[PDB]
């Protein structure tokens, strides 16, 4: 069985109300993982559910053990760096790059929704790349929150919020900044709920169509908020060139390859 003594401490990946996430190395394999340490005190929809949700673009739960105090989840750790870091080193991504990343995300989401699982955390900080250029949706953050309108108005974490999160993520990928990046900030509540999001002119009209769709304020009208869930999104104008089987097969080539030797390469483990 796994136990605290099976790992070497590397650094803190994230702290939080729920607990913390540490970057560790399993002495037996020399392999790297992120260990989420949840206070039992503080605490279900997070345990087991993720424990089993396995998908190419979802971080995998390697081991799940518990101390008498906390709950520990050792999960695979992408070593190709964080999306935020790559994005910012380019200000924006080519629309085809957005595309490449968004589709791997759509693939994960279609999957989670097929199991009546709402992700709630689709956002740039939760995105990393693995050694090969492929996306890994993480479960934790190392930025203003852009909750979905129905979450702000009704505390309604239904399927749609994931599509809303997909839109905010690609809007930033293609524009280089959030939708209300300049407008103060304590304004976010009223802006998200009632301000129209405007799109740069430099955006292909399909891309402009996708964003306008993913960012609909009415879940009932969002691209993906319809009973067909992911399908509305997989079949959007913006998404034609795509081969979804290809997508989930990791058969697509990543438009960017992180500069790591092997998953063992610890070079992205800094800033």
Curated annotation (Swiss-Prot):
Tissue expr: Widely expressed. Expressed in myoblasts.
Residues modified by glycosylation: 143
Outcome of mutating residue 36 to A: Loss of kinase activity
Keywords: Acetylation, Apoptosis, ATP-binding, Carbohydrate metabolism, Cell membrane, Cytoplasm, Developmental protein, Diabetes mellitus, Disease variant, Disulfide bond, Endosome, Glucose metabolism, Glycogen biosynthesis, Glycogen metabolism, Glycoprotein, Kinase, Manganese, Membrane, Metal-binding, Nucleotide-binding, Nucleus, Phosphoprotein, Proto-oncogene, Serine/threonine-protein kinase, Sugar transport, Transferase, Translation regulation, Transport, Ubl conjugation
Active site: 121
Localization terms from the record: Cytoplasm; Nucleus; Cell membrane; Early endosome
Catalytic activity, reaction form: L-seryl-[protein] + ATP = O-phospho-L-seryl-[protein] + ADP + H(+); L-threonyl-[protein] + ATP = O-phospho-L-threonyl-[protein] + ADP + H(+)
Positions of the Protein kinase domain: 7-239
Post-translational modification (record): Phosphorylated and activated by PDPK1/PDK1 in the presence of phosphatidylinositol 3,4,5-trisphosphate.
Annotated positions binding ATP: 13-21, 36
E.C. no: 2.7.11.1
GO cellular component, one term: ruffle membrane
Function: Serine/threonine kinase closely related to AKT1 and AKT3. All 3 enzymes, AKT1, AKT2 and AKT3, are collectively known as AKT kinase. AKT regulates many processes including metabolism, proliferation, cell survival, growth and angiogenesis, through the phosphorylation of a range of downstream substrates. Over 100 substrates have been reported so far, although for most of them, the precise AKT kinase catalyzing the reaction was not specified. AKT regulates glucose uptake by mediating insulin-induced translocation of the SLC2A4/GLUT4 glucose transporter to the cell surface. Several AKT2-specific substrates have been identified, including ANKRD2, C2CD5, CLK2 and PITX2. May play a role in myoblast differentiation. In this context, may act through PITX2 phosphorylation. Unphosphorylated PITX2 associates with an ELAVL1/HuR-containing complex, which stabilizes CCND1 cyclin mRNA, ensuring cell proliferation. Phosphorylation by AKT2 impairs this association, leading to CCND1 mRNA destabilization and progression towards differentiation. Also involved in the negative regulation of myogenesis in response to stress conditions.
Record remark: domains: Binding of the PH domain to phosphatidylinositol 3,4,5-trisphosphate (PtdIns(3,4,5)P3) following phosphatidylinositol 3-kinase alpha (PIK3CA) activation results in AKT2 recruitment to the plasma membrane, exposition of a pair of serine and threonine residues for phosphorylation by membrane-associated PDPK1/PDK1 and activation.
Clinical condition linked: Defects in AKT2 are a cause of susceptibility to breast cancer (BC). AKT2 promotes metastasis of tumor cells without affecting the latency of tumor development. May play a role in glioblastoma cell survival. Type 2 diabetes mellitus: A multifactorial disorder of glucose homeostasis caused by a lack of sensitivity to insulin. Affected individuals usually have an obese body habitus and manifestations of a metabolic syndrome characterized by diabetes, insulin resistance, hypertension and hypertriglyceridemia. The disease results in long-term complications that affect the eyes, kidneys, nerves, and blood vessels.
Protein's recorded name: RAC-beta serine/threonine-protein kinase
Naturally occurring in which organism (per UniProt): Homo sapiens (Human)
Range within the parent protein: 146 to 441 of 481
């Amino acid at each position: 069985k796994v136990t605290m003594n099976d790992f070497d401490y590397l650094k803190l990946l994230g702290k939080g109300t729920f607990g913390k996430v540490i970057l560790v190395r399993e002495k037996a394999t020399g392999r790297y993982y992120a260990m989420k340490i949840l206070r039992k005190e503080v605490i279900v929809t997070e345990s087991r559910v993720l424990q089993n949700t396995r998908h190419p673009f979802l971080t995998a739960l390697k081991y799940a053990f518990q101390t008498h105090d906390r709950l520990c989840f050792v999960m695979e750790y992408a070593n190709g760096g964080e999306l935020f870091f790559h994005l910012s080193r380019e200000r924006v991504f080519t629309e085809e790059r957005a595309r490449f990343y968004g589709a791997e995300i759509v693939s994960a989401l279609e999957y989670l929704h097929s199991r009546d699982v709402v992700y709630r955390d689709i956002k740039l900080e939760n995105l990393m790349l693995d050694k090969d250029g492929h996306i890994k949706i993480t479960d934790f953050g190392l930025t203003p929150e852009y909750l979905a309108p129905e979450v702000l108005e009704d505390n309604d974490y239904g399927r749609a919020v994931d599509w809303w999160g997909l839109g905010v993520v690609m809007y930033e990928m293609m524009c280089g900044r959030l939708p209300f990046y300049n407008q103060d900030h304590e304004r976010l509540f009223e802006l998200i709920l009632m301000e129209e999001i405007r799109f740069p002119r430099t955006l292909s009209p399909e891309a402009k169509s996708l964003l306008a769709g993913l960012l609909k304020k009415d879940p009932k009208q969002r691209l993906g908020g319809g009973p067909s869930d992911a399908k509305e999104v997989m079949e959007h104008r913006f998404f034609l060139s795509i081969n979804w089987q290809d997508v989930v097969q990791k058969k697509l080539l990543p438009p960017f390859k992180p500069q790591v030797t092997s998953e063992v390469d610890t070079r992205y483990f800094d800033d």
